[PDB]
Amino acid sequence: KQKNSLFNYIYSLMDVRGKFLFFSMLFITSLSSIIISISPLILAKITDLLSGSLSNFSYEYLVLLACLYMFCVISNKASVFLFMILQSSLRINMQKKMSLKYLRELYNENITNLSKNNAGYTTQSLNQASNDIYILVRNVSQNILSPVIQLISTIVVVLSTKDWFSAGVFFLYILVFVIFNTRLTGSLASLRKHSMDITLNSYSLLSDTVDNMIAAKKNNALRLISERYEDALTQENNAQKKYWLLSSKVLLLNSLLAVILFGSVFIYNILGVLNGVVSIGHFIMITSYIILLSTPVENIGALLSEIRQSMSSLAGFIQRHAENKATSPSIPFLNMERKLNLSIRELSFSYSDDKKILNSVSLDLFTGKMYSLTGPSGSGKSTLVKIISGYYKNYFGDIYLNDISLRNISDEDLNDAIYYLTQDDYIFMDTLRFNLRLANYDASENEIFKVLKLANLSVVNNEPVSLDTHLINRGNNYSGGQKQRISLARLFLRKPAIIIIDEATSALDYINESEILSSIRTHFPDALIINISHRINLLECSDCVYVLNEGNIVASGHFRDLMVSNEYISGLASVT
Amino acid sequence: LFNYIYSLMDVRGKFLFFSMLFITSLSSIIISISPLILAKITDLLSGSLSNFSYEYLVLLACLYMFCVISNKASVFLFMILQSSLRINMQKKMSLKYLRELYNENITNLSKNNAGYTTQSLNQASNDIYILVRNVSQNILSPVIQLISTIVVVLSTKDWFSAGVFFLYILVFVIFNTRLTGSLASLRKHSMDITLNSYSLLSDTVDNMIAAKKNNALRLISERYEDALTQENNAQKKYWLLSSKVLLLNSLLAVILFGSVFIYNILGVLNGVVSIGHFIMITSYIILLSTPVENIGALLSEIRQSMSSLAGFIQRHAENKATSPSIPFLNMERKLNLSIRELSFSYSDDKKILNSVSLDLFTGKMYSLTGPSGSGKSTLVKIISGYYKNYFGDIYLNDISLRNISDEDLNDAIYYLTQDDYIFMDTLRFNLRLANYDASENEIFKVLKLANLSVVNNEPVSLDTHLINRGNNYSGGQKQRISLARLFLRKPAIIIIDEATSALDYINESEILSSIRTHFPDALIINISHRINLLECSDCVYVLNEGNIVASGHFRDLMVSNEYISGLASVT
């Protein structure tokens, strides 16, 4: 069942030009194997015409025979060049469609599954899959019809000349070969998959070390860094050497079998020629078939290996990327209001197992009101707002948005209703314009520049900020606070009912922090605001404060009514 | 270039490479006898065919079979040795890259992402492979087969055949070398666009959550689709030139070798040329395709894999400037810092530090504050030796920073960065980054001082696996990993750049207390917008638009300076 889905996926990557290039590749490979299967007869016909005549034969017929053999050789080589030209054209063609399908498939994946592996890994995963497709496309377009044609004609013709020992041992070889190899193909595929997986692990570790180079440099940790890569490379080599040995043995054994079987057919026909039983023409024909048969035997060997091993390695890729189990019963086009109230009822959560992060969070929040959420680091403030922001779906309890449950809200609608300002910044390596267009695609040049003022990013170091400012990897082109302001400017282009600020202002100075937080409430008057902070001034300003401790909400109400009652907030309000 | 590829080969690597060259050379000698054996077989068919001439035909047929068998055994043996050599050279190449990346400057490292550096290694691996191959297979072997052909056809005194044969190799080597550079440039430019495309994929995948939550599939997809379109167009441009060269080389071969075939046909029809010679000539025409092809590869492949590999060495080894300083263990126990008229620019277009003049001393805690964009991080980064292109001077007990080895500087100073750098590995590995030789106890002791020995009423294991960017942990728990590192280190200067922002007042004060206790003589610079650290410091420094605008005690500054007055009023 998964075998059919695999080839349908490869077929789908081919547009109209792609389908033609693939069929042209199949046709040309098939046509040339018909033509080249004729050539050992031509050679035999040349041999007899000369043998046993003392220059007494049609010289015009020898020339016609020599020219037909040349046509065979020329057409077969033209076919090889034409196939490889079509092959590269089809690679180029299928490449783009393959790569976008991956990116679009990655976008539709859940946060939990995305977080599992780094960019180094996902980047080399595409690499392996692209190459795997390539191999499969080739093996199908070249090693299916062509070797069958050349092997059928060879047994048919050798059977026709009533040579039973030759056609017998010939058919015996293809039988012993196809059996022996298939009885060792899976064993190679498994050794190859396991190797390619270790290879992903190795690229994963390289990107992990390169992304945190600064840390390893500053701690003078070259030894620790180098050793864990050297270990990964050693796991890679050993996994590769294990494949190499099996591959080398199969090849040696297949070679020795060919030498024993085809060698006998050669000695048999030698003795047949020496005892006048077999003609020289026929001897040359059997000699010519033995030589010609190597390439279709090679193409079969390849197919049996390459098809099974690229199918296995490609199966594994489709698995860890399309395990789509979501299908949450969402309301079709249920547009959300200006004023939305949140209701969290007995919410429970665990990231893995073994540990519960949220005990039984019961909360009730309303439109146009600002709420503060605090507690020690490890309580689960981020976790709670992430669940509200639909990062995670396997939660116990219920979350409502004016009677409508989160479970019945589409991830697109939820993301339009709520805007989460993350603890960590996510700045795209692109223009400032691009980073802000992330919030709203259709935003005009003015709407974007207006938003810079609101985030206090219209002027940097008494100089006007350009929308074409190129932003380096992780936006380290900008200061900690300037990074936070990019993410803040995004909120102003969006139009949400709920606004979550998870320690999203921590890197800003008192002036900026207050001015932006002011502009937020001004621009979004009816917006419900959840604010996560460890600071009294951000807690003071709220309509109500919530204290989270080890998963459970331990205290509620006004900050002033809590700064003496609650153990945590009294600990914060220890500021002289 | 070839010295670099040679260096990647150990003893097993050098053997495998020479075995590959030998076997390729030996088989081309053997297969160059082949058309003469075919001639003798054609001679016998139209000649001697007595009992002895039948036995001579069989011994001849066996020699041709030996040629064909030995040539194929050689092909299989070469590919076995090639893969063995690939495996062999692979590890040595990859570590050289990592070690080369570690020794690069922060400014150059920041220039490209992981997606880019990862696929950069990929391209160079493949470029080495091609070069190793074209050298071990397409140099001696085609020369042997082309020399012997012209020698033998010259010997049978056929001038038109050996003439047009030599003419082809001459026209071929000329025509192709004329277009090789044009192909290499089109290929390099394509491979570079390919890096740009992998760079954009890793950039999008690393910031997927942002694009997902902003429902930005269209903007994200469009950007990649554009990059892929720049990739296809760069690839199609190479494809066409490649396809033209191949079709023109094919048409030239059909015209020149076709003539040699027609000439010898007419020679056979007019009794001028024997059938035995006619076969030997077509047998040489057929045989010559593979050495012509291997020269076609050698000419084109050696040049294009040298161009793209030249680029890779350029961007990963150019460091013409190197200050021959070297004063060793520049400091012991105690340290003082002296910044004199420090000025700095990142891209020279704008000045970040105007003329910072500061003086700091042992055992004293100092606070540095100012608006976001003033340059607090910039200044401490320069103190931490991130950048060396600065005007002015920085001293560390009379010794200038310029004369302090990056190793010694990193042992004297410990910078706790604004952003956290958690390795995807065990907690043990993340802390062993600070001190390799640290014992299980030294590491666990440090976990307590970091307030990380217990998470959610459970004791923290040193074998805790930490996901990509340490997102397996809370913002504050990430900061505590970086803080736990400091307690394994032994510095004279300790910089805390907003390194406790994600921590609550209880832990911030509790850890900051254990820092001062464990490092009593340590000079401490603290960058904070909060006051619970500014009030605690022996002196406060206010940075505004590059220049240090205010100094002294915090209390004496919330009277004098309006910024410090306004900040304290947040009570």
Ligand SMILES: Nc1ncnc2c1ncn2[C@@H]1O[C@H](COP(=O)(O)OP(=O)(O)O)[C@@H](O)[C@H]1O
């Ligand atoms: N690596 C960099 N490349 C270019 N410009 C940078 C870089 N890092 C920071 N900047 C610029 O230098 C200014 C000062 O740097 P920084 O220390 O990060 O500011 P802050 O006072 O917020 O700590 C920033 O406002 C920013 O525009």
Ligand SMILES: Nc1ncnc2c1ncn2[C@@H]1O[C@H](COP(=O)(O)OP(=O)(O)O)[C@@H](O)[C@H]1O
């Ligand atoms: N993505 C995650 N995967 C696994 N564990 C996590 C994740 N995020 C946080 N945790 C765990 O959950 C707890 C609290 O998480 P978090 O919401 O980030 O904390 P905080 O109270 O600082 O907001 C921690 O004890 C931490 O180990």
Ligand code: VO4
């Ligand atoms: O790990 V937290 O308390 O959001 O900073």
Ligand code: VO4
């Ligand atoms: O970018 V700074 O947060 O150190 O103001």
Ligand SMILES: [Mg+2]
């Ligand atoms: Mg949090």
Ligand SMILES: [Mg+2]
């Ligand atoms: Mg800073």
